[PDB]
Amino acid sequence: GSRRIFSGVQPTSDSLHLGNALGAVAQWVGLQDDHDAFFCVVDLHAITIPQDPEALRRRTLITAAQYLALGIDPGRATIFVQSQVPAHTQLAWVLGCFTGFGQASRMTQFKATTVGLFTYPVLQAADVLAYDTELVPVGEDQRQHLELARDVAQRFNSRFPGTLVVPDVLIPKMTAKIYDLQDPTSKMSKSAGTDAGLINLLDDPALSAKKIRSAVTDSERDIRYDPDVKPGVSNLLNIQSAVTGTDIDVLVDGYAGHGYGDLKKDTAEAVVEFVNPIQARVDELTADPAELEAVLAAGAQRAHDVASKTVQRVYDRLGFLL
Amino acid sequence: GSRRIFSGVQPTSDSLHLGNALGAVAQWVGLQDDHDAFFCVVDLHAITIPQDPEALRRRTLITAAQYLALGIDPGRATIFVQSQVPAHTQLAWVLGCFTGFGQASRMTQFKATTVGLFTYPVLQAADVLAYDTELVPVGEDQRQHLELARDVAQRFNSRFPGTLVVPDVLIPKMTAKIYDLQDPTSKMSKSAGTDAGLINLLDDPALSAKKIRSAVTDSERDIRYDPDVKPGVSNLLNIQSAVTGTDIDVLVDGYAGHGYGDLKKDTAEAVVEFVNPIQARVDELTADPAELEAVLAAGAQRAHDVASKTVQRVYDRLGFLL
Numbered sequence: 001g002s003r004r005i006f007s008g009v010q011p012t013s014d015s016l017h018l019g020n021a022l023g024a025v026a027q028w029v030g031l032q033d034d035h036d037a038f039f040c041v042v043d044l045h046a047i048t049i050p051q052d053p054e055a056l057r058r059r060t061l062i063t064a065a066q067y068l069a070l071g072i073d074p075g076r077a078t079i080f081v082q083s084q085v086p087a088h089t090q091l092a093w094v095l096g097c098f099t100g101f102g103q104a105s106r107m108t109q110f111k112a113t114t115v116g117l118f119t120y121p122v123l124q125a126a127d128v129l130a131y132d133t134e135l136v137p138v139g140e141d142q143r144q145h146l147e148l149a150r151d152v153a154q155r156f157n158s159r160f161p162g163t164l165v166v167p168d169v170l171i172p173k174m175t176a177k178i179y180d181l182q183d184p185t186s187k188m189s190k191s192a193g194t195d196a197g198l199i200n201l202l203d204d205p206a207l208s209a210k211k212i213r214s215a216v217t218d219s220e221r222d223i224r225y226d227p228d229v230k231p232g233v234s235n236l237l238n239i240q241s242a243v244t245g246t247d248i249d250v251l252v253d254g255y256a257g258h259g260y261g262d263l264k265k266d267t268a269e270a271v272v273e274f275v276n277p278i279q280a281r282v283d284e285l286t287a288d289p290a291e292l293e294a295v296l297a298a299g300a301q302r303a304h305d306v307a308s309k310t311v312q313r314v315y316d317r318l319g320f321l322l
Numbered sequence: 323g324s325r326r327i328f329s330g331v332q333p334t335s336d337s338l339h340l341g342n343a344l345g346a347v348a349q350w351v352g353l354q355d356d357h358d359a360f361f362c363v364v365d366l367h368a369i370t371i372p373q374d375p376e377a378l379r380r381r382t383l384i385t386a387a388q389y390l391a392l393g394i395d396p397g398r399a400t401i402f403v404q405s406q407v408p409a410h411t412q413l414a415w416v417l418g419c420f421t422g423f424g425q426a427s428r429m430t431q432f433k434a435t436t437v438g439l440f441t442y443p444v445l446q447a448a449d450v451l452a453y454d455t456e457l458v459p460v461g462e463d464q465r466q467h468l469e470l471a472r473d474v475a476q477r478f479n480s481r482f483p484g485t486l487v488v489p490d491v492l493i494p495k496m497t498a499k500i501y502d503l504q505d506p507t508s509k510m511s512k513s514a515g516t517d518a519g520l521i522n523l524l525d526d527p528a529l530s531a532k533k534i535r536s537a538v539t540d541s542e543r544d545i546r547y548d549p550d551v552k553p554g555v556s557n558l559l560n561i562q563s564a565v566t567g568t569d570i571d572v573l574v575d576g577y578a579g580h581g582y583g584d585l586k587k588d589t590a591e592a593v594v595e596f597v598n599p600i601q602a603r604v605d606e607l608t609a610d611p612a613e614l615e616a617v618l619a620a621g622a623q624r625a626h627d628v629a630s631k632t633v634q635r636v637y638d639r640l641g642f643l644l
């Protein structure tokens with residue numbers, strides 16, 4: 001329970017992309033050694049959009065496998081599937097009763113729609129608050145969601161002091177947003193349309209290298225870090241720095257006198273070396289699922305033990321008959 | 323599982339009124355002998371409005387006690403508290419993903435707001451659909467809610483054939499709407515403002531008799547059944563017929579030559595005889611709670627055994643990892 005953290009990714013495709021891996025999971029890996037961590041595959045969130053059932057099940061497992069292959073350690077952290085812990089939807093109903101309609105209407109994605117698309121930020125708040133979470137490591141695109149979660153927790157604690165932990169949001173600087181390679185002002189997302197700007201962890205590594213070589217850059221022939229003036233170039237530097245461990249300024253210094261072909265070739269090569277061991281791990285975890293299944297089953301038990309107590313505390317404060 | 327029915331009442335006050343008792347529970351009592359029945363105290367719904375916790379717990383028990391005192395038979399039916407069965411909120415989240423935003427926006431109460439006030443019709447659909455319910459006995463004010471429930475079930479079964487039972491709505495004719503005694507065009511409701519037009523089951527019987535004697539009537543000095551021309555008079559006849567078992571036309575025939583004082587005096591007396599045995603039963607169930615508690619605990623177990631299987635069927639169809 002020391003420095004408890006919570007985070008999750010939707011099983012909405014066959015592969016995470018660099019945004020997920022560098023903007024979220026890489027932070028998780030650094031945090032798990034000294035933080036008590038719950039890492040969730042949020043399959044309940046996935047069905048806000050129609051999902052093919054066979055694919056949804058398959059992608060749930062492969063999202064968890066990508067956690068292990070990115071270095072999440074089941075001996076140090078808990079990995080579980082959202083839908084296996086009923087407390088999430090129980091708390092979501094309670095929190096929705098403390099969430100203003102206008103609050104939810106102002107959320108960016110909503111602001112065709114279903115109730116699920118309207119209320120998922122409330123389920124997201126429940127996902128975090130159910131585990132007495134102290135810190136939430138996400139990318140920048142989640143900031144507005146977790147401000148709602150903090151507001152609703154404080155509004156609830158107003159009525160019922162000390163019931164819910166109010167979580168701090170932990171959003172990195174450099175990898176807060178990995179951008180699409182074909183449109184470097186737009187964040188890398190699973191729905192860019194064409195995925196030529198999208199780098200998937202489990203895609204054929206030469207296809208990813210090819211996409212990096214075609215990355216949009218500028219006209220200045222000057223490798224320097226300036227995301228607002230030089231989006232493409234700064235993104236590439238961000239990617240290379242993130243997958244290598246080399247600081248951006250050390251890279252920019254080494255790139256003095258170099259052109260953009262050298263920047264793309266080096267980033268392509270670094271990414272290829274990044275994803276090759278990931279793909280080998282995921283392949284084995286898919287071919288031999290017993291290991292992954294035991295991890296998720298232990299995770300669910302642990303998650304349930306924690307989450308159910310939070311729900312019973314909340315229910316007791318509200319005055320429900322227990 | 324034969325002719326399975328489901329219905330519920332909110333624990334939002336210290337007493338049901340005649341609307342609840344005649345428009346809903348009286349139908350339940352007639353149905354329970356040859357229908358497999360689940361009767362629910364829907365405490366999750368109550369918190370869409372802020373509730374005092376001590377009161378909420380106390381009113382949950384007293385709503386269940388009023389079920390027993392109105393004749394619900396724990397040997398023939400299941401009585402349970404909504405919040406004790408997690409399946410309700412699990413299915414509510416799924417169904418919300420199949421509910422149009424405009425669908426929910428068109429609901430009468432919504433059409434100040436919270437997400438809970440916006441989404442409670444979806445939780446109501448889950449309440450019913452979780453038990454493979456074939457028939458839902460409600461008053462007229464619930465018709466639009468249960469049309470949503472039927473639509474969402476059919477929309478879900480469209481994707482996933484045969485997963486959910488589509489319930490038939492069972493709404494009585496005469497007691498579909500018991501009207502307020504001071505405003506006979508408005509339905510008896512817990513929030514009329516002044517409760518001089520509201521007849522509570524557990525109020526002092528002489529206070530209720532006094533309210534009936536002050537009931538708004540017309541100017542014609544003619545006792546006949548015509549709800550659109552004679553709202554007050556038709557309501558009184560509806561009430562007397564419902565609490566006595568005497569058909570309306572037999573009563574109207576007996577009232578030939580009589581004035582409205584006779585109608586109010588007879589209805590007051592019939593209601594007093596109705597509520598006196600109810601109050602005696604509820605008093606004992608409040609003073610000695612062991613009986614009620616065992617009923618609700620057995621009910622929760624039974625409800626859970628059924629509802630959890632529905633959720634697992636739904637989850638399997640969606641493609642969740644089980």
Ligand SMILES: Nc1ncnc2c1ncn2[C@@H]1O[C@H](COP(=O)(O)OP(=O)(O)OP(=O)(O)O)[C@@H](O)[C@H]1O
Pocket residue numbers: 008009010011012018019020022023024137138139140141142175176177178179187188189190191
């Ligand atoms: N381009 C990105 N850069 C950095 N972090 C990202 C990026 N995209 C997503 N993330 C992070 O990944 C986590 C989970 O996001 P999610 O599962 O919604 O992935 P997504 O790529 O946004 O998928 P979708 O397009 O289906 O929403 C969040 O912490 C989010 O901030």
Ligand SMILES: Nc1ncnc2c1ncn2[C@@H]1O[C@H](COP(=O)(O)OP(=O)(O)OP(=O)(O)O)[C@@H](O)[C@H]1O
Pocket residue numbers: 330331332333334340341342344345346459460461462463464497498499500501509510511512513
């Ligand atoms: N005036 C009425 N006449 C007939 N039936 C009624 C009346 N009011 C409520 N009912 C029935 O009672 C059941 C439960 O309703 P509910 O718990 O919402 O009571 P309510 O009186 O409407 O309380 P509230 O004012 O808090 O909504 C429903 O089946 C509803 O149709």
Ligand SMILES: CNC1=NC(=O)[C@H]([C@H](C)c2c[nH]c3cccc(Cl)c23)O1
Pocket residue numbers: 006007008009010042045046048120123124127128136138142
């Ligand atoms: C459509 N649903 C949806 N879109 C989002 O971006 C969020 C994310 C995926 C999320 C859910 N629960 C969490 C708990 C912690 C951190 C996060 Cl990032 C989440 O939910």
Ligand SMILES: CNC1=NC(=O)[C@H]([C@H](C)c2c[nH]c3cccc(Cl)c23)O1
Pocket residue numbers: 328329330331332364367368370442445446449450458460464
């Ligand atoms: C604010 N919430 C709310 N208002 C209503 O009128 C409905 C009712 C009380 C209800 C909930 N679940 C049910 C299952 C079956 C039948 C009924 Cl009547 C209900 O819910």
Ligand SMILES: [Mg+2]
Pocket residue numbers: none
């Ligand atoms: Mg997203």
Ligand SMILES: [Mg+2]
Pocket residue numbers: none
């Ligand atoms: Mg009502």
